[PDB]
Amino acid sequence: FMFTFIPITHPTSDTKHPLLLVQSAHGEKYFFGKIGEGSQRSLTENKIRISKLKDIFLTGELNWSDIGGLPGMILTIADQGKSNLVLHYGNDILNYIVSTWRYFVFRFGIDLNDHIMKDKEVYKDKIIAVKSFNVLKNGGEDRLGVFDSFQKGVLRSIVAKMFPKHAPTDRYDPSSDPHLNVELPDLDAKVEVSTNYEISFSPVRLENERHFAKVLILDIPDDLYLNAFVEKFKDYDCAELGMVYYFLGDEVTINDNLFAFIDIFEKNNYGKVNHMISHNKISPNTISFFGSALTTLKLKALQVNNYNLPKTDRVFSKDFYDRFDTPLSRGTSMCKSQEEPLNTIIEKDNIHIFSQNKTVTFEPFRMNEEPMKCNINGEVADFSWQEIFEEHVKPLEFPLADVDTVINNQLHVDNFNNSAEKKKHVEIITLGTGSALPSKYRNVVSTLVKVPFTDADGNTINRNIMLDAGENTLGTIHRMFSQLAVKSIFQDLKMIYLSHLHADHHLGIISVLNEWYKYNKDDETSYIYVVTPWQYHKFVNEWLVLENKEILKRIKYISCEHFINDSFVRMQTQSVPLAEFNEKLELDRDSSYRDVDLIRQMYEDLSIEYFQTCRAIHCDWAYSNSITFRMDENNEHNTFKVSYSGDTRPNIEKFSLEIGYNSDLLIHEATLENQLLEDAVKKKHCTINEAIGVSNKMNARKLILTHFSQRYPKLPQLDNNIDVMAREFCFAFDSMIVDYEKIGEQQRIFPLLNKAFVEEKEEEEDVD
Ligand SMILES: [Zn+2]
Ligand SMILES: [Zn+2]
């Protein structure tokens, strides 16, 4: 009869938002906070179990950063077999959110209910009780809301169609269903609201009854909210209030003004109240994925210059750290949000940094006899590059792999565009190299190709090209590079291509577009081309009208079917209006016409000589594609040709021999180990051989393999009986930076590479 408040994620390069798990004495579990990108992967890394959990209390404003991990989480918690699941929030917008995920989220046998809480509504459980409060950024009280009662009705119906009781038909693709092409309700009466929660606990039980402290969970996106937050909480009775949790946004600044809000909650009736601060200039930037970081470090020991080491630094808030204690050690970068020190009545032993191993436990107590029982356990997870080197990689004894050459003298060096050659010829960063589920060791797919273009005058600029981007792609980016380096990358990001509608390929695209906007915002003539299946353009539109309408004025979407190398262009479905969703559908004749104006305009802008696609043998509306880049003004013959499979079953007829043919570089899917050939054919992916076979008939001058399914990090088992028709090749690993010219210099290391992860083999074999 006790509760532990165990933090899952804190603000960090990989994990942008806080998430908190409250766990009962006998295992009843509830999430509070935000289910952002990487938040489902961080559960598996740390071996946390989600048995009994069916309640997610979503706080704050809901943009893509705050919920991009949620589609993933739902389809993972379903695949794990969870019967029910309830999403809580204080605004009807939540149903519009899940509704935007029609074409990519579908699971039967899960009872997914959305619970839209009124302003002061209580949710009583057997064990817990949870009252909500909705702060409204600018206004006071919520009147009509956002959607009318008909609009709310149809949105709930879409959610029901997404998570039905019984299986529909065995060959059912949400992509290829006409009834999901609905016109979602317009966001005109939309409101900016932070949802917060008060958590009370059920008393324990002739004798006399013991009570529990009350936890408040606040979520403040930015400063403009604070005026509304003081207006809503000034007269809030802090009687039995034991702790307040502050989920403070990036945009909120740590100044006298914030602490005038915090000061409201200085006292309770039986003593003082402890404060827990989650903020990105306060919480440390620890490594979130140690599996990945170790795997990356071992790989850097073999081929240095092809990996960056995970950064762990950030600027902290001097104002804060000085006003309490552990002031900064003078090497680490500080920030000073104001001239004067912090004006606040809070004591140092009653305020704490929200961090990963910093758990809090509440025991019950005799109301007015004794002080309220609350115990803040744990310390920040310390970490040392040198100490993990000597333990985990030094004993492997690789050629010239030592604590200096791998770590120390590499620690301050970006291996992206630095050298002479690297400027004027192609690079590929493989930011994710995995199938379906984010694993401990390989994140979901993303492939970023730098294709340079040299000018008449002879100076050379990059054309960065995104080829899919699953959950937390912008995370894995922010982690490898410094902030100074990310700006240049997004300023040169000219195109985003999606192969198909599976969630492992697109769930980071919105984050990517948000970041692209951050950097290209200010150039009125800066645009981004987005070539995707047409259903994903529905999403982008219905999402960005919610989150940032302005970005839609810079997106120049083509559509994959308008590049198909086929006389016949498949006709897309006509959008069925809102009214007529209730209980054949006409196709759109105009959708058959290639948007040739915009294609020609892409070619001129990005210097593409030819872009074309073909159909992948996988999903409906899947695609494989091939792009030919002219490399300078003063040369006709200087073309570079890239090709990228979707999740295709090997397609040697239409892709290898036709569109892909004679390509300088192929990037192909190699999901399955050869041993699982009969599973690959059902799941519609190539095996490592079937991939190499495609690369062969194509005549790929070079090859890269990605989208690996694996129980553990290994180099794939090459078949001795098959040739590599390809002057150079390599196997992708998360955060890897090849130069196109130097793709082959992995082959030299192939024998040693296999040895490197025997530690991770024996570990994952603990179940076998
Ligand atoms: Zn996939
Ligand atoms: Zn797929």
Q: What angle is formed at CA 404 by the lines to CA 401 and CA 406, rounded to 5 degrees?
A: 50
Residue 376 bridge partners (DSSP):
360
Q: Which of 694, 735, 730 is nearest to 715 (CA)?
A: 730
CB 644 within 8 A of CB 499: yes
CB 605 within 8 A of CB 630: no
CB 481 within 8 A of CB 448: no
Say which CATH architecture domain 426-565+591-764 belongs to.
Answer: 4-Layer Sandwich (3.60)
Helix (H) or strand (E) segment spanning residue 218: strand 214-220
State the angle between helix axes of 509-520 and 483-491 in degrees (0 to 180), rounded to the nearest 10.
90
Report the alpha-carbon distance of residue 445 to residue 477 in Å, rounded: 13
Q: Which of 308, 303, 305 is nearest to 398 (CA)?
A: 303
DSSP string, 717-747: ---TTS---SSEEEE--TTEEEEGGGSGGGG
- Tokens 């890897």 belong to 736
Indicate which ligand has the atom closest to the C-alpha of 616: 2
Helices (H), ranges, 201-354? 226-233, 256-262, 290-302, 318-323
Helices (H), ranges, 433-556? 473-480, 483-491, 503-506, 509-520, 534-547
Quote the distance between the C-alpha of residue 758 and its chain's center: 29
Query: Token pair for residue 127?
Result: 């064990």
> Starting at the edge strand that comes first in sequence, how are the strands of the sheet with 493-497 ordered?
555-557, 528-531, 493-497, 460-469, 446-454, 427-432, 736-739
Helix (H) or strand (E) segment spanning residue 680: helix 677-683
Query: Token pair for residue 65?
Result: 């950063």
Report the alpha-carbon distance of residue 667 to residue 691 in Å, rounded: 10
Collect all residues with Cβ–Cβ distance below 8 Å to 467 and sequence separation of at least 6.
446, 447, 448, 449, 497, 499, 644, 667
Q: Which of 68, 478, 516, 477 is nearest to 314 (CA)?
A: 478
- Tokens 């897309």 belong to 572
Report the alpha-carbon distance of residue 730 to residue 430 in Å, rounded: 11
CB 208 within 8 A of CB 120: no
CB within 5 A of ion ligand 2: which residues?
Answer: 502, 647
- Tokens 């989480």 belong to 73
Report the alpha-carbon distance of residue 511 to residue 8 in Å, rounded: 21
State the angle between helix axes of 93-100 and 149-162 in degrees (0 to 180), rounded to the nearest 10.
40
Indicate which ligand has the atom closest to the C-alpha of 709: 1
Q: Ligand 1 center to residue 718 CA distance, Å?
A: 21
Q: Ligand 1 center to residue 183 CA distance, Å?
A: 28
Q: Ligand 2 center to residue 507 CA distance, Å?
A: 13
Report the alpha-carbon distance of residue 269 to residue 325 in Å, rounded: 27
Indicate which ligand has the atom closest to the C-alpha of 504: 1
Query: Token pair for residue 186?
Result: 């317009």
3-state secondary structure of 653: helix
Quote the distance between the C-alpha of residue 319 and its chain's center: 31
Do the domains at 3-283+315-376 and 426-565+591-764 have one common CATH topology?
Answer: yes
Residue type, 740: Y
Q: Ligand 1 center to residue 249 CA distance, Å?
A: 33
Query: Token pair for residue 469?
Result: 């981007």
Report the alpha-carbon distance of residue 651 to residue 673 in Å, rounded: 18
The DSSP output letter for 553 is G
CB 94 within 8 A of CB 114: yes
Q: Ligand 1 center to residue 673 CA distance, Å?
A: 15
Query: Token pair for residue 387?
Result: 């100490």
Pairing state of beta strands 351-353 and 274-278?
A: parallel
Residue type, 592: S
- Boundaries of every domain in the chain: 3-283+315-376, 293-306+384-415, 426-565+591-764
Q: Ligand 2 center to residue 490 CA distance, Å?
A: 26
Report the alpha-carbon distance of residue 367 to residue 309 in Å, rounded: 52
Q: Ligand 2 center to residue 718 CA distance, Å?
A: 23
First to last CA, the chain: 36
What are the Cα distances from residue 649, in Å, to 172, 444, 537, 683? Answer: 18, 19, 25, 9
Helix (H) or strand (E) segment spanning residue 640: strand 639-644
CB 190 within 8 A of CB 546: yes
Q: Ligand 2 center to residue 572 CA distance, Å?
A: 20
What are the Cα distances from residue 201, in Å, to 34, 196, 242, 376? Answer: 22, 17, 12, 18
Helix (H) or strand (E) segment spanning residue 246: strand 241-248
Q: b/e map of 370-386 (b: 16 or more CB within 10 Å)?
A: eebbbeeeeeeeeeebe
Report the alpha-carbon distance of residue 159 to residue 154 in Å, rounded: 9
Experimental determination approach used: X-ray
Q: Ligand 2 center to residue 535 CA distance, Å?
A: 15
Q: Ligand 2 center to residue 621 CA distance, Å?
A: 11
Indicate which ligand has the atom closest to the C-alpha of 502: 2
CB 372 within 8 A of CB 213: yes
Report the alpha-carbon distance of residue 59 to residue 221 in Å, rounded: 10
Q: Ligand 2 center to residue 463 CA distance, Å?
A: 26
Phi-psi region of 708 (alpha: psi -120 to 50; beta: other; left: phi over 0): beta
Indicate which ligand has the atom closest to the C-alpha of 684: 2
Collect all residues with Cβ–Cβ distance below 8 Å to 721 and sequence separation of at least 6.
none
Q: Ligand 1 center to residue 648 CA distance, Å?
A: 9
Residue 31 bridge partners (DSSP):
21, 56
Indicate which ligand has the atom closest to the C-alpha of 444: 1
Q: Ligand 1 center to residue 707 CA distance, Å?
A: 7
Q: Ligand 2 center to residue 707 CA distance, Å?
A: 10
Query: Token pair for residue 489?
Result: 């990358």
Residue type, 637: H
Secondary structure (H, E, C), 571-603: CCECCECCHHHCCCCCECHHHHCCCHHHHHHHH
In angstroms and rounded to an integer, the radius of gyration of the C-alpha atoms of the chain is: 27
Residue type, 183: E
Pick the CATH number of 3-283+315-376 from 3.40.50.2000, 3.60.15.10, 3.40.50.300, 1.10.530.10: 3.60.15.10
Helix (H) or strand (E) segment spanning residue 696: helix 688-698
Query: Token pair for residue 279?
Result: 């903020």
Q: Please state, as a whole number, how many other Cβ atoms lie within 10 Å of the Cβ of residue 624.
A: 29
Q: b/e map of 305-344 (b: 16 or more CB within 10 Å)?
A: bbbbbbbeebebbbbbbebbeeeeeeeeeeeebeeeebeb
Sign of CA dihedral 418, 422, 424, 429: negative
Pairing state of beta strands 241-248 and 274-278?
A: parallel
3-state secondary structure of 75: helix
Q: Please state, as a whole number, how many other Cβ atoms lie within 10 Å of the Cβ of residue 246.
A: 23
Query: Token pair for residue 270?
Result: 């039986």
Q: Ligand 1 center to residue 473 CA distance, Å?
A: 14
| Most distant CA atoms of the chain, gap in Å | 94
Q: Ligand 2 center to residue 72 CA distance, Å?
A: 14
Q: Please state, as a whole number, how many other Cβ atoms lie within 10 Å of the Cβ of residue 96.
A: 24
Residue 133 bridge partners (DSSP):
196
Q: Which of 560, 743, 535 is nearest to 646 (CA)?
A: 560
Secondary structure (H, E, C), 222-239: CHHHHHHHHHHHCCCCCC
CB 278 within 8 A of CB 9: no
Q: Ligand 1 center to residue 436 CA distance, Å?
A: 5
Indicate which ligand has the atom closest to the C-alpha of 434: 1
Query: Token pair for residue 88?
Result: 């809580």
Query: Token pair for residue 476?
Result: 């894995």
Collect all residues with Cβ–Cβ distance below 8 Å to 423 and sequence separation of at least 6.
417, 452, 460
Q: Ligand 2 center to residue 617 CA distance, Å?
A: 10
Pairing state of beta strands 528-531 and 555-557?
A: parallel
3-state secondary structure of 49: coil
Q: Ligand 2 center to residue 727 CA distance, Å?
A: 29
Report the alpha-carbon distance of residue 573 to residue 586 in Å, rounded: 7
Burial class of residue 359 (count of CB atoms within 10 Å of its CB; 0-12, 13-18, 19+) = middle
- Tokens 């990945």 belong to 292
- Where do the DSSP E strands lie in 313-388? 316-317, 334-335, 351-353, 360-362, 374-376
CB 201 within 8 A of CB 129: yes
Q: Ligand 2 center to residue 473 CA distance, Å?
A: 17
3-state secondary structure of 274: strand
Report the alpha-carbon distance of residue 193 to residue 171 in Å, rounded: 41
Q: Ligand 2 center to residue 768 CA distance, Å?
A: 28
Report the alpha-carbon distance of residue 609 to residue 628 in Å, rounded: 6
